[PDB]
Design a protein around this motif. Structure first.
Motif, PDB file in Angstrom:
ATOM      1  N   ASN A  17       0.832  -1.199   0.000  1.00  0.00           N
ATOM      2  CA  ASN A  17       0.000   0.000   0.000  1.00  0.00           C
ATOM      3  C   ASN A  17       0.869   1.252   0.000  1.00  0.00           C
ATOM      4  O   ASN A  17       0.642   2.182  -0.783  1.00  0.00           O
ATOM      5  N   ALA A  18       1.886   1.282   0.861  1.00  0.00           N
ATOM      6  CA  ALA A  18       2.716   2.475   1.000  1.00  0.00           C
ATOM      7  C   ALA A  18       3.740   2.586  -0.124  1.00  0.00           C
ATOM      8  O   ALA A  18       3.844   3.630  -0.776  1.00  0.00           O
ATOM      9  N   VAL A  19       4.504   1.520  -0.370  1.00  0.00           N
ATOM     10  CA  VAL A  19       5.586   1.557  -1.351  1.00  0.00           C
ATOM     11  C   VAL A  19       5.006   1.629  -2.757  1.00  0.00           C
ATOM     12  O   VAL A  19       4.614   0.606  -3.329  1.00  0.00           O
ATOM     13  N   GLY A  20       4.961   2.830  -3.326  1.00  0.00           N
ATOM     14  CA  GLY A  20       4.398   3.010  -4.651  1.00  0.00           C
ATOM     15  C   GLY A  20       5.171   3.970  -5.531  1.00  0.00           C
ATOM     16  O   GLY A  20       6.388   4.124  -5.380  1.00  0.00           O
ATOM     17  N   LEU A  21       4.467   4.617  -6.466  1.00  0.00           N
ATOM     18  CA  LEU A  21       5.114   5.553  -7.381  1.00  0.00           C
ATOM     19  C   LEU A  21       5.745   6.726  -6.643  1.00  0.00           C
ATOM     20  O   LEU A  21       6.751   7.278  -7.104  1.00  0.00           O
ATOM     21  N   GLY A  22       5.173   7.122  -5.505  1.00  0.00           N
ATOM     22  CA  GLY A  22       5.725   8.238  -4.756  1.00  0.00           C
ATOM     23  C   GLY A  22       7.119   7.974  -4.223  1.00  0.00           C
ATOM     24  O   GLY A  22       7.897   8.912  -4.023  1.00  0.00           O
ATOM     25  N   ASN A  23       7.455   6.704  -3.984  1.00  0.00           N
ATOM     26  CA  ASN A  23       8.774   6.376  -3.455  1.00  0.00           C
ATOM     27  C   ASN A  23       9.866   6.640  -4.482  1.00  0.00           C
ATOM     28  O   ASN A  23      10.972   7.063  -4.125  1.00  0.00           O
ATOM     29  N   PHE A  24       9.578   6.395  -5.762  1.00  0.00           N
ATOM     30  CA  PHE A  24      10.598   6.434  -6.798  1.00  0.00           C
ATOM     31  C   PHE A  24      10.465   7.607  -7.758  1.00  0.00           C
ATOM     32  O   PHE A  24      11.455   7.967  -8.399  1.00  0.00           O
ATOM     33  N   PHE A 245       1.504  11.230   1.643  1.00  0.00           N
ATOM     34  CA  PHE A 245       1.369  10.499   0.388  1.00  0.00           C
ATOM     35  C   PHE A 245       2.106   9.165   0.433  1.00  0.00           C
ATOM     36  O   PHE A 245       1.558   8.130   0.032  1.00  0.00           O
ATOM     37  N   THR A 246       3.351   9.164   0.919  1.00  0.00           N
ATOM     38  CA  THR A 246       4.172   7.960   0.827  1.00  0.00           C
ATOM     39  C   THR A 246       3.701   6.871   1.785  1.00  0.00           C
ATOM     40  O   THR A 246       3.910   5.682   1.518  1.00  0.00           O
ATOM     41  N   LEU A 247       3.063   7.243   2.893  1.00  0.00           N
ATOM     42  CA  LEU A 247       2.535   6.274   3.842  1.00  0.00           C
ATOM     43  C   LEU A 247       1.061   5.967   3.615  1.00  0.00           C
ATOM     44  O   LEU A 247       0.486   5.179   4.371  1.00  0.00           O
ATOM     45  N   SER A 248       0.443   6.569   2.595  1.00  0.00           N
ATOM     46  CA  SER A 248      -0.979   6.385   2.304  1.00  0.00           C
ATOM     47  C   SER A 248      -1.846   6.814   3.485  1.00  0.00           C
ATOM     48  O   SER A 248      -2.858   6.184   3.800  1.00  0.00           O
ATOM     49  N   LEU A 277       9.388  -0.361   6.400  1.00  0.00           N
ATOM     50  CA  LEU A 277       9.723  -0.885   5.079  1.00  0.00           C
ATOM     51  C   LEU A 277       9.574   0.181   4.001  1.00  0.00           C
ATOM     52  O   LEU A 277      10.368   0.230   3.054  1.00  0.00           O
ATOM     53  N   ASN A 278       8.561   1.043   4.128  1.00  0.00           N
ATOM     54  CA  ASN A 278       8.355   2.089   3.129  1.00  0.00           C
ATOM     55  C   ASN A 278       9.471   3.124   3.168  1.00  0.00           C
ATOM     56  O   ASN A 278       9.959   3.556   2.117  1.00  0.00           O
ATOM     57  N   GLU A 279       9.894   3.531   4.366  1.00  0.00           N
ATOM     58  CA  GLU A 279      10.957   4.526   4.467  1.00  0.00           C
ATOM     59  C   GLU A 279      12.277   3.981   3.935  1.00  0.00           C
ATOM     60  O   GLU A 279      13.056   4.719   3.322  1.00  0.00           O
ATOM     61  N   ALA A 281      12.494   1.735   1.452  1.00  0.00           N
ATOM     62  CA  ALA A 281      12.336   1.772   0.002  1.00  0.00           C
ATOM     63  C   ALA A 281      12.362   3.198  -0.539  1.00  0.00           C
ATOM     64  O   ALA A 281      12.750   3.416  -1.692  1.00  0.00           O
ATOM     65  N   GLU A 282      11.957   4.179   0.270  1.00  0.00           N
ATOM     66  CA  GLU A 282      11.867   5.552  -0.216  1.00  0.00           C
ATOM     67  C   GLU A 282      13.221   6.255  -0.188  1.00  0.00           C
ATOM     68  O   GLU A 282      13.716   6.710  -1.225  1.00  0.00           O
ATOM     69  N   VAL A 283      13.838   6.354   0.988  1.00  0.00           N
ATOM     70  CA  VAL A 283      15.043   7.168   1.108  1.00  0.00           C
ATOM     71  C   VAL A 283      16.306   6.399   0.722  1.00  0.00           C
ATOM     72  O   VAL A 283      17.270   7.004   0.242  1.00  0.00           O
TER      73      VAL A 283
HETATM   74 NA    NA Z   1       5.329   5.328  -0.316  1.00  0.00          NA
END
Ligand code: NA
Ligand SMILES: CC(C)C[C@H](N)C(=O)O
Ligand code: NA
Length: 489
Positions: A17-24, A245-248, A277-279, A281-283
């Motif tokens: 849910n969190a790890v999406g287009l906003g991460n990359f 956005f990144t955490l939905s 996990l999202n952070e 994948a994001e940073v």
């Molecule tokens: Na995200």
């Protein structure tokens, strides 16, 4: 009621849910525009003061409502605040994920179409930065249907339109199989694939050496700090918006997903793990790929230019041009767009589940009919984004930016003030493998709402295709309010 099968599947579905287009796509440009390395200061502060608390609150509200058979905010807000105006405010928990889905799934279809074209090598092939980027700017414009003149109309290619159909079909194929046999089963396959793809891309980028620069030069550029612009309130607004956005957060998606968690199952450690996990994948992964590879190839001089070009120019023009200039780069392009597609897909199914859950919970529709009707509304509404320029921007602003922050404050006040801070605190920690630190009680009750309220106030003191989009998304809210009315009677 349907439930998640395993704890691992729950975490990977929430992480998807969190790890999406906003991460990359979103995060690299956000960081480069709002201080570089210094942007991590408001980003981490927002993550700890807003992201983490609102995440646990949404997990609790979802599971609380799920025990009573309700997965969406119109019913859940009413359960927490016996007032009709709580139902109307709850409509935003359906309006926001629907509107965001309308343009998110279309962007998702771009990554699938680019993945197809790159896998089969149907990409342009060009010396000079503008001489290398022009063929790929025209490649994206032909795919999207950019006008030759001043017209504000888009005319997508037949390929792009068909790929959008395939994208909708794929979302339906997952969502129509339910929570455990659909979303959860796909998350256990897509999330490991996602991290492996991203880690491989980071490694390949860190090996780039060109006559204009290296990956180290790109990392230096990205994480070059500029602490002076921490005085700009726009940097703090950008950081909080990115965290939402990144955490939905504020999309009603976490609440709906959490409504399929059993009443006594842990949500403290599960939610913390998904957010962590999202952070990562994001940073760590998202930041290390696109911008460093861009600087490594075009040098630091051109780095400022492409950084200000935008996320779409970086993800669909600049990075494809770089790929076409390396050995086997068309396959690296495929992996890049495959990464984005699975990142978008795991997010879009989460953002379409609230409307599916509302039709099942409140209108008693079957899963087959709820999924097909939700896809039909999204597919039809997406023609606005497909053919009207600046329509996506307006939707992303009202729903995916202003809306989510207002809704995050709303669900916070309903859960922690109207429902009861002590009751909400007990509801969060119940069944938790670990317990929430006591300091976060005072953060949720006083710090987070004061932070969001002041941001709202500071945010307020700082064509006509826009009215077409405004008209339509207002009608969507009216439509959803009528369905909530029909659900009452
Ligand atoms: Na995200
Ligand atoms: C709307 C959400 C599903 C967005 C997602 N959290 C992302 O970072 O891309
Ligand atoms: Na995702």
């Amino acid at each position: 009621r349907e439930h998640w099968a395993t704890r691992l599947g729950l975490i990977l579905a929430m992480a998807g849910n969190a790890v999406g287009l906003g991460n990359f796509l979103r995060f690299p440009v956000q960081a480069a525009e709002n201080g570089g390395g210094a942007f991590m200061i408001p980003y981490i502060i927002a993550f700890l003061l807003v992201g983490i608390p609102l995440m646990w609150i949404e997990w609790a509200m979802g599971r609380y409502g799920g025990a009573q058979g309700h997965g969406t905010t119109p019913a859940i807000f009413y359960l927490l605040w016996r007032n009709r105006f709580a139902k109307i405010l709850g409509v935003f928990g359906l309006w926001i994920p629907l509107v965001v889905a309308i343009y998110y799934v279309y962007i998702e279809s771009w990554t699938l179409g680019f993945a197809i074209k790159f896998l089969v090598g149907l990409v342009p092939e060009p010396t000079d930065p503008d001489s290398i980027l022009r063929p790929f700017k025209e490649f994206l414009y032909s795919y999207i249907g950019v006008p030759k003149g001043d017209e504000p109309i888009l005319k997508p290619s037949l390929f792009a339109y068909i790929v959008f159909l395939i994208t909708m079909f794929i979302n339906v194929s997952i969502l129509i199989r339910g929570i455990s046999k659909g979303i959860e089963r796909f998350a256990k396959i897509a999330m490991p694939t996602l991290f492996i793809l991203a880690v491989f891309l980071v490694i390949r980028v860190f090996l780039l050496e060109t006559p204009n620069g290296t990956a180290a030069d790109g990392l230096n550029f990205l994480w070059t700090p500029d602490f002076e612009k921490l005085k700009d309130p726009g940097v703090w607004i950008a950081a909080v918006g990115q965290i939402f956005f990144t955490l939905s957060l504020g999309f009603g998606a976490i609440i709906t997903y959490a409504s399929y968690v059993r009443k006594d199952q842990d949500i403290v450690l599960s939610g913390l793990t998904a957010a962590t996990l999202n952070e990562k994948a994001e940073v760590i992964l998202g930041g290390s790929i696109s911008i460093p590879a861009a600087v490594a190839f075009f040098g630091v001089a051109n780095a400022v230019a492409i950084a200000k070009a935008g996320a779409f120019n970086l993800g669909f023009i600049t990075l494809p041009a770089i790929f076409s200039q390396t050995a086997g780069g068309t396959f690296l392009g495929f992996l890049w767009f495959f990464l984005l597609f699975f990142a978008g897909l795991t997010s879009s199914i989460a953002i379409m589940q609230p409307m599916i859950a509302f039709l099942e919970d409140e209108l008693k529709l079957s899963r087959k009919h709820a999924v097909l009707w939700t896809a039909a509304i999204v597919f039809f509404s997406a023609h606005l984004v497909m053919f009207l320029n600046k329509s996506l921007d307006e939707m992303d602003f009202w729903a995916g930016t202003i809306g989510v922050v207002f809704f995050g404050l709303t669900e916070l006040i309903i859960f922690f003030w109207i429902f009861g801070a002590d009751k909400a605190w007990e509801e969060i920690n119940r069944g938790g493998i670990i317990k929430v630190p006591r300091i976060y009680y005072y953060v949720m009750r006083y710090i987070t709402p004061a932070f969001l309220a002041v941001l709202l106030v500071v945010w307020a003191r700082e064509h006509w295709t826009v009215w077409i989009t405004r008209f339509y998304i207002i009608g969507l809210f009216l439509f959803l309010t009528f369905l909530v009315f029909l659900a009452e009677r």
